[PDB]
Every structure is written in structure tokens, then in C-alpha cells.
Amino acid sequence: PVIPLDPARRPVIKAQVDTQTSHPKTIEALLDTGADMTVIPIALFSSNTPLKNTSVLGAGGQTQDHFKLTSLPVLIRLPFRTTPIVLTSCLVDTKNNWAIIGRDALQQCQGVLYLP
Amino acid sequence: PVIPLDPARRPVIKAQVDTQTSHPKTIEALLDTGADMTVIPIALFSSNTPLKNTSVLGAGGQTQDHFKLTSLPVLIRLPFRTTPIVLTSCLVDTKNNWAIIGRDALQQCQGVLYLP
């Protein structure tokens, strides 16, 4: 669909995320064209699964141990599309449990920005 | 126009920004649906103009004295428009030198996200 943009309403969407370590869960993610890579909360994972250290830039700088990478791909189903998005890897937020859909996922839906 | 979304290429636009404290400058800005409010580099303002303190969200927490707020409105002109976007207030980046067009400005352009 078409999602209007409003400073006062964040463009969010309900997504089913399968990390391949639990059963798939539904979360509400921000649609973010300024994010290179998708971010999902660690609350989706079982406490045993391994992750990798990583780096990423942010508004107050870049962090060291805040965000981790998944070892296995992550599958994402959106309400409209029937087939899942498959990300080779994406970021895991261990602190704030942010959920953000980035340009890696938006390219696989062939998403676009449109400015009239 | 249509701006395709690609994890490897940041979606940027060229925008003329008028702080009303110096002469207008054309800069390169990121188009960011995940930003509530537009961010402007402090380099576009006068060394004498007054700014106000405030808070912001961002990857890795929130920062106190990294961003300030403008005291005067900011005007923004796009390539395909001569009528200026008018932001009654927007954020100022005192360090990192980010230029981000957020949803406050995208609303006045009538910009939308489209997911097929």
C-alpha cells in the first residue's frame, strides 16, 4: 500500500519475524529509509543462540557492544506480500529492543520513496 | 520522482537550505522516513545566532548536548519546487555534520512510502 508521512505518526507495520530459533513472532516495526540494515529485538531469540559482534553508526555516535549480528538468515512476512523476505543477516538490538525495517528489506519488497 | 531503495546506496537529495541567519546553501541531505524532525548542520548558521537545548533519540540511546533546536524557522527548497518548505523548528547537528530530511519536511512535499 501507500503510507503517508507525518511527523506526528511514525510509519509502523506489523511483521511476522522468524529468527529460526523460536517459533515466528509478530512485532510492530518502523519503516526506515535512512537505515541500511534491519534491526530486530533480542526478545525474539532463545537465550542460547549465538550472535556476532559488530559496529554501526547512530545519532549519538556509533556503538561497540550494543548491536549484534545474526548468524542465520531471518525471514519476515508482511501482511500484504505472500512470500517472505529473507535477510542474509540483520542487526539485533540487545538493549532497547528496537524493531526497524531498513533498505535491505525494502529493496526485496521493491519499496520506493515517491516525492510528487 | 520515484526514489528506489537499496541498502548499498543512501537515498539522498540536493536541497537549498535557508537558516535565515546566513546566506542560503545547497547541500546533500538524506531522505529519512524514520526521522520525526529534520536535521541541519551547524555550519549553515551564523557563529552569532542563538540556539536552544533539547533532547533527541538515536542509535545507542539519546544525547543531551549533541543536538540543539533553531530559534528561527528554516526554509527548504527542492529541485522540483520553487515554493519553500517551511519548518517552524528543526534540529541542528553541532558535531557530526548530518543533513537529514525528516517527516516534517516530507509531509509538506506530499511524499509517501509505497510498498507494492
Ligand SMILES: CC(C)CN(C[C@@H](O)[C@H](Cc1ccccc1)NC(=O)O[C@H]1CO[C@H]2OCC[C@H]21)S(=O)(=O)c1ccc(N)cc1
Ligand atoms: C543517520 C541515520 C543512519 C540514523 N539512523 C536512522 C534514523 O531514521 C533513526 C531511527 C530511529 C527512530 C527513533 C528512535 C531511534 C532511532 N532516527 C533518528 O535518529 O532521527 C532522530 C532525529 O529526528 C528525531 O526524530 C525521531 C528520530 C530522531 S540509525 O537509527 O542510527 C541506524 C543506522 C544504521 C542502521 N543499519 C540502522 C539504524
